[PDB]
Amino acid sequence: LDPNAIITAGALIGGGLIMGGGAIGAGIGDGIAGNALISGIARQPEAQGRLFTPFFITVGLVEAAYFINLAFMALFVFATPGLQ
Amino acid sequence: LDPNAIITAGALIGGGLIMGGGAIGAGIGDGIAGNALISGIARQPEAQGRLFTPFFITVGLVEAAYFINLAFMALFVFATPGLQ
Amino acid sequence: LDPNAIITAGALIGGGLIMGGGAIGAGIGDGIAGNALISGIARQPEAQGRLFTPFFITVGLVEAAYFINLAFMALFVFATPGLQ
Amino acid sequence: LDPNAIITAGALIGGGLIMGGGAIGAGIGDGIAGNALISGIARQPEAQGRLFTPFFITVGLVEAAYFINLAFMALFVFATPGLQ
Amino acid sequence: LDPNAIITAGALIGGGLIMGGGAIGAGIGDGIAGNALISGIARQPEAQGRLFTPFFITVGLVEAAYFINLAFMALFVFATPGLQ
Amino acid sequence: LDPNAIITAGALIGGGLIMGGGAIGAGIGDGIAGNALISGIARQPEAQGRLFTPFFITVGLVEAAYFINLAFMALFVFATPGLQ
Amino acid sequence: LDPNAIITAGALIGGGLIMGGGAIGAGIGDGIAGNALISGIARQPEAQGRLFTPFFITVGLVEAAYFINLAFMALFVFATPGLQ
Amino acid sequence: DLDPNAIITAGALIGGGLIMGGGAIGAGIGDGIAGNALISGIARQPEAQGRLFTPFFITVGLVEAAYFINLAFMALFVFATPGLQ
Amino acid sequence: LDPNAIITAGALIGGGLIMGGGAIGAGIGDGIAGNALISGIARQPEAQGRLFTPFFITVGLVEAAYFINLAFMALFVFATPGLQ
Amino acid sequence: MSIFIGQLIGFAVIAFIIVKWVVPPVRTLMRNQQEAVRAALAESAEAAKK
Amino acid sequence: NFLIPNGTFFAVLIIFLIVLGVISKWVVPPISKVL
Amino acid sequence: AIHVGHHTLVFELFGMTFNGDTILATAVTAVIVIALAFYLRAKVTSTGVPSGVQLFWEALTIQMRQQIEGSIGMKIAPFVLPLSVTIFVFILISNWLAVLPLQYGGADGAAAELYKAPASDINFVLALALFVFVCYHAAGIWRRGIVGHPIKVVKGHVAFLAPINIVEELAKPISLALRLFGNIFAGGILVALIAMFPWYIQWFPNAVWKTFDLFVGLIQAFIFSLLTILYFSQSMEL
Amino acid sequence: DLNVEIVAVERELWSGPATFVFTRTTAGEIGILPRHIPLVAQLVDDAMVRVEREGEDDLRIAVDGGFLSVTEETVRILVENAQFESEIDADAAKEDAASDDERTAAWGRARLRALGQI
């Protein structure tokens, strides 16, 4: 019964899972890193100068888990593997 | 059973997942960043001005991710890929 | 099977996910921002007058996301895209 | 298959999701606010009363949020949108 | 396939979600409140009697939601809404 | 394609949700309570005698939620409601 | 399709959810209890000797949960209830 | 007829996916928390790093154990799928 | 219906699950480790190199789990076991 | 080409925002650095003369 | 598909190399000397 | 329709396909970088007041040198200073040029772009990541020996976690590429979605998105540069 | 009951059993009960101390340079200067409040808080 229909339905479900998990992870990680940054800046002003270096690194390590997954989402939704 | 019906159902499910994950991530990241900002303002009132800067960076990331989800869900429902 | 039946079932499931994620994010973020505000009040009661300014901003956006999700859920269960 | 059967099954699963997310959010937020209140009282017992007014806000804003889900679940399982 | 079979399967899924969310929320809230109570008791043992006044509220307000879920679970799994 | 088969599959999925949510909540709550206890004992090696009480209360609440979920999952799988 | 086929599909999915929840709970709880133990050892090196006492108990109360879930996988997979 | 073997395969694959999702969430977050504790300890006590390795790894050990256990079970689901006809 | 279509749809959904869980875990773990690193930097400006190594160990474990998920999802999708 | 008009209007809005808010502070930073290096050069010449 | 690597993999790489040459012989050493 | 993954000027040489759009974008970015470099070199003043271009270049160099020195000995790894910095500027330009209003209609309603950031092409990010991977692995070989360097990396910080270290190494290159890819790929897709709206509705969301995408691109170039320096420092020790 | 002992640099100000001690450290307000865990905190620059004792109205003490130290059985507040409520002048604190010197302002505000004017 139109197998490609089931293929694309499964692909859409998979991409939804991709985006949901990635968004949850990115939001939580970025919020935690921002909390760390704000607390550190509250501890002393000058420290801000050196805080953005590790902080961005953290963000760099966080957003990756999102955007990596984001790529796969496209691979799932546009160039669906095993689409027949 | 027209296949496009199954495609649209799967796309709606995927959009639901995307919004669920985006909402969870955005809400919790906002909560954490705001907790940091509120604690900082409580402890050092004179830090108020210098605290809104990093905070809006954190939000600038968190909310951004949410917006990305908001877009892709639309692509799922209003421009369902592979609908054919 | 009537295709519209599958369409509306999928849309209603998606709305269910949207509510679930929005409620999770709203509750967790609002609770975290609260915890912050209560800690500020207990530690430094004088801060109370100035604590509503950041807190309501924080919570102010926390609801926004959630409320935004709510809107789209109404789109899902009342104006289901692709409905026939 | 009766269309209303699958539509109502989807509605029930959606309501299950709605309450699952609402209960998760309410539990997390209420627990976090309670932790804040308990810690504040432990640090300054006589502050107990003063902390109820802030506390009741966040709880009154977290629990309240969850309650919206309940209402909508009725619309999902008692007057189901698009119920043929 | 009998439509009532699909209805009951959807109802069981919904109730499973009810309990998943409710148990997660209740467990996490109890853990967080207990962490706060244990920290307070360690800090101010003589305040124990006072610290139980808010604690029972928070638990009394967390478990409440969980029990509320239980209620509607029955309505899902015993008197299925929309059943034919 | 017996209706009993569909109902049993739905019941199994629901019970799986019961157990998954209960296990997540129980594990995280127990971990948090144990973290509180460990910190208290490390700071005050002589306080374990009075710390065990609130820790036991928290563990009791968490395990009560977990075992209620266990009982309801058993109700699902072994005596499926609605099954004909 | 054979009824046992869908029965076993549902059983597999339910067992997968059970293990997912158990793994989440165990990992999170033991990570938090660890954090506690490492912090205590950092503050009180010698206290290590006594800190292992509560820690194990915490791990127990977490690990037990996971193992219990493990058992039910068998009860769900190797001996699926309701199979015909 | 729907070729029940396909139904079993799909169910087993979804179960393995759920097992991996839970296991990865638990392992990643637990390792992150333990590493947070280790980093804070080393920051507070620069000379305690070695003393901190002994507990840290222990905790991490058990964390990874759960993940690995899940891994094992997934190998049963996808390849040696139980309930196959 | 095509058995291959069902098998590959299940494979895509399972891969989406794998990646969603991996992304959540990786993002949250990286965020927490980065919070620890940023707090350490704020406290001690000169501990930069010293705090690299343990933060890199933690991030290494987290990303190792994430990319184990990536490899297993690639196996699931591109070379699906049980694909007949 | 309606989308072309829309994206052109968007770019115009972006450029207006940039010129209104971002350009002035960065121009001030560049001026501060240029003045600092010029003052360092003048002070070095004065020190050599001294 | 889009994620599949293509031949342009090399071409872009080549360009990057020459950029290095411009930055390793006309930008960075002079700037280090200036500082 | 959106038609993700589309390309133009796709041709073949030596029995291998080439994406003309990516080549053109990379060539334009490299030309801009080289023009800036030569403008600086012609008007570089060690004694007089420096021009804005000199301020920009010296700020980039100072930042990169500061991170290099902090992570590792600056004297130990001079070659890292150029590589790192160039990457930054390269990626930065590769992203910021996307702000220019080059979105039009392809006669089917699908948005078409004269210039798409090469990062949206997997080949660009893969080339950059593999280049940096090879560079710092070779540097590790140089500073630890042909056989010692693999031994140290597999041993890692702690020996009995050798398996993870393997994955750790394999995590470094791909993580560097895909991350960047996504950060731009989204944008490459995202603008197209707004292009579905009419002009009087397309102007606003596109404006906001591109205003934020400027910051996203700058942050991503910075992240990639610091991560490259960090991996270089990791692979060259003892 | 816990043995509170407010001690100045020049002498010992006051001592005795009490039921509760409310003060304000750098982190924030704090309350000390009979079995509070050991603590060493710096009182805020303009700190005030309220001691609640059995069968007697709460003692309000304006403190300068306070340093609270809580032990298993004692609470000691190390005050570079102190003033009981009976000895504080509302007019003096009000007039000298918010002067050109921060320490003077802190002492005046501590006097005001002890008086309860706030």
Residue numbers in the entry:
A (entry chain O), B (entry chain N), C (entry chain M), D (entry chain L), E (entry chain T), F (entry chain S), ...: 3 to 86
H (entry chain Q): 2 to 86
J (entry chain d): 1 to 50
K (entry chain b): 23 to 57
L (entry chain a): 10 to 247
M (entry chain H): 3 to 120
Original authors' sentences:
The membrane domain of the mycobacterial ATP synthase is embedded in the IPM, with the catalytic F1-domain of the enzyme extending into the bacterial cytoplasm and attached to the membrane domain by a central stalk and a peripheral stalk (PS). As do other ATP synthases in eubacteria, chloroplasts, and mitochondria, the enzyme couples a proton-motive force (pmf) across the IPM generated by respiration to the synthesis in the F1-domain of the enzyme of ATP from adenosine diphosphate (ADP) and phosphate by a mechanical rotary mechanism. The mycobacterial rotor consists of a membrane-bound ring of nine c-subunits, attached to an elongated central stalk, made of single copies of the γ- and ε-subunits. The mycobacterial PS is made of two proteins, bδ and b′.
Extensive classification of the data for the mycobacterial ATP synthase revealed the presence of not only the three main states referred to as S1, S2, and S3 but also of substates within them. Substates S1a to S1e are in S1, and S3a to S3c are in S3. Further round from S1b by ca. 2° lie S1c to S1e, which have similar c-ring positions to each other, but there are large differences in the F1 domain and in the PS. The positions of the top of the PS suggest that the order of procession is S1a > S1b > S1e > S1d > S1c. The main differences between the substates within each state are that the positions of the PS and F1 domains vary such that the F1-domain (including the α-helical coiled-coil of the γ-subunit) appears to pivot around the PS during the catalytic cycle. However, alignment of the substates via the “crown” in the F1-domain shows that they have identical nucleotide occupancies and that the position of the γ-subunit is also maintained. Each nucleotide binding site in the three α-subunits and in subunit βTP is occupied by an ATP molecule with an accompanying Mg2+ ion, while the site in subunit βDP has ADP and an accompanying Mg2+ ion. The sixth nucleotide binding site in subunit βE contains an ADP molecule with neither accompanying Mg2+ nor phosphate. During rotation through S1 in either direction, the γ-subunit approaches very close to the PS at b′Arg72, and potentially a salt bridge could form between this residue and either γAsp170 or γAsp171. Unlike the tether, which can be formed in any of S1 to S3, this feature can form only in S1, when, during rotation, the γ-subunit comes sufficiently close to the PS for a salt bridge to form.
